[PDB]
Structure 1
């Protein structure tokens, strides 16, 4: 039972907002990554129990996944786009820290991150 609670996707006191940038993040960035062939392992938290990776949450203390990001965006959890961008970067970084280069998961993260960076370059409010 080595899985933590997942990251919060709502919070009573944290102020909530919808900006054009946050709409772009849900409707274009998340949408393109979510439907990518390599999205699926990132669509929910890492299941250290199911994967038999009992040390995952010993090593990764700031977990993040796209399921979480998607719910945060749908819930207007974020105040600004930078918060969301930060979550995507945390997701990628965690994957690169925990796994070794040439692991399939790392190659999947690299392909998603390329696409992420391309979509982030067109972020509106321009």
Structure 2
């Protein structure tokens, strides 16, 4: 019935770096997932008000979405690739916690996560 503030996508107090791995995450991983036919439920924060999900933010206390991850990558928010991978994992895990197995949203998250893992296993060695 009321949405929380969305996750931050900038913060001058957070340490940040540019790495070839973070470049890969934006140019390959995020690009591939963003354009996927099943991307759209994950491209913005869950609007629990508009979607009539009064329980969502009573269950999901660490929200994350690909729109936020996209902005964090574009804004050079991360210190390393593992911080970004964690955000993706939070997004997927939130979906499985809130929804039921076999739900359409869970099947779509599972398809995206399979592709995410295929791309992550080709993550370049840090130069």
Once residues 100 and 13 of structure 1 are traced to their aligned partners in structure 2, the CA distance between those partners, rounded to angstroms, is 38
Structure 2 residue matching 1:124: 3-state secondary structure: coil
1:124 CA drift (Å): 0.1
Length, aligned pairs only: 124
Give 5+ residue unaligned stretches, structure 1: none
The residue number in structure 2 matching 1:7 is: 7
Alignment partner of 1:108 is 2:108: yes
1:33 CA drift (Å): 0.3
Task: Supply the RMSD in Å over aligned alpha carbons.
Answer: 0.8
**11-20 or 77-86: which moved more?**
11-20
TM-score, normalised on structure 2? 0.96
Once residues 32 and 50 of structure 2 are traced to their aligned partners in structure 1, the CA distance between those partners, rounded to angstroms, is 27
1:110 CA drift (Å): 0.3
Once residues 36 and 42 of structure 1 are traced to their aligned partners in structure 2, the CA distance between those partners, rounded to angstroms, is 11
1:40 CA drift (Å): 0.5
Once residues 17 and 46 of structure 2 are traced to their aligned partners in structure 1, the CA distance between those partners, rounded to angstroms, is 28
1:12 CA drift (Å): 1.3
1:17 CA drift (Å): 1.3
Give 5+ residue unaligned stretches, structure 2: none
Structure 2 residue matching 1:16: 3-state secondary structure: coil
1:55-101 Cα offsets, whole Å, 9 max, x none, are: 10000000000000000000000000000000000000000000001
The residue number in structure 2 matching 1:21 is: 21
1:16 CA drift (Å): 1.8
Once residues 48 and 106 of structure 1 are traced to their aligned partners in structure 2, the CA distance between those partners, rounded to angstroms, is 17
Once residues 77 and 63 of structure 2 are traced to their aligned partners in structure 1, the CA distance between those partners, rounded to angstroms, is 17
Once residues 50 and 78 of structure 1 are traced to their aligned partners in structure 2, the CA distance between those partners, rounded to angstroms, is 30
Listed as ranges, the matches of 1:28-67 within 5 Å are: 28-67=28-67
